Design a protein around this ligand. Structure first.
Ligand SMILES: C[S@@+](CC[C@H](N)C(=O)[O-])C[C@H]1O[C@@H](n2cnc3c(N)ncnc32)[C@H](O)[C@@H]1O
Lengths: 119, 119
């Protein structure tokens, strides 16, 4: 079971220059809790969840780039699913962006996406 | 093991008239993702998570009352811990406020609390 295999839908990403409100609107619109942030060239630079929306409000930040998590735990398109599951238990995270060798975001894998593949 | 036997900290609550930003500050300060909302008597009236903070910002809500979830599953201090775990699975929830005879909040049990004891 590789990752590039189990991807079912397009990636949803955002740029870092956007407001906290715009980011929140994106989460709600797509009903997602993980939003990979890409630069103007489509390359991964960070990640946002609803926790970071709360954190931005608490720290009085205006843009996503001031609050996004910059050390992103990722999976490779050619990576095995079990390794991703272990990554997610180890770091206690529930979503990992899937990247290629050029750092483009090809999708995202969640712990619900995985929950299916084990049960 | 009753609920009262596993509570390890005081309750953390907020009033319904506080701003979205002020609620967000409470979540971040205490590193919690569930915030029971109470009235002037301390009676449970709702609950918020960081997801609700995001929802509120997206919708330009001003206070917590405008976004809080009012349909809140609870536990009593004298309820078996296992019965709380059963509720979490049954209603697909991750945080259960613990209430007393006046419906005041005396603590909260989370999914992580359960996994730490019984995972
Ligand atoms: C308190 S931790 C708990 C993790 C929880 N699953 C969440 O949604 O955030 C919250 C932080 O995890 C970070 N985070 C979530 N997924 C991540 C990932 N794949 N790589 C790096 N950081 C991540 C987010 O930036 C957020 O600020």
């Amino acid at each position: 079971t590789l990752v590039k295999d189990i991807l079912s839908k397009p990636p949803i990403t955002a740029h870092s220059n956007i407001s906290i409100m715009e980011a929140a609107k994106i989460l709600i619109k797509h009903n997602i809790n993980h939003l990979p942030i890409v630069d103007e060239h489509g390359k991964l630079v960070g990640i946002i969840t609803s926790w970071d929306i709360a954190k931005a409000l608490a720290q009085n930040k205006k843009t996503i780039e001031e609050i996004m998590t910059r050390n992103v735990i990722t999976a490779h398109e050619d990576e095995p699913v079990d390794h991703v599951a272990i990554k997610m238990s180890k770091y206690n995270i529930s979503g990992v962006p899937v990247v290629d060798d050029y750092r483009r975001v090809v999708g995202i894998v969640t712990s619900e996406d995985i929950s299916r593949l084990f049960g």
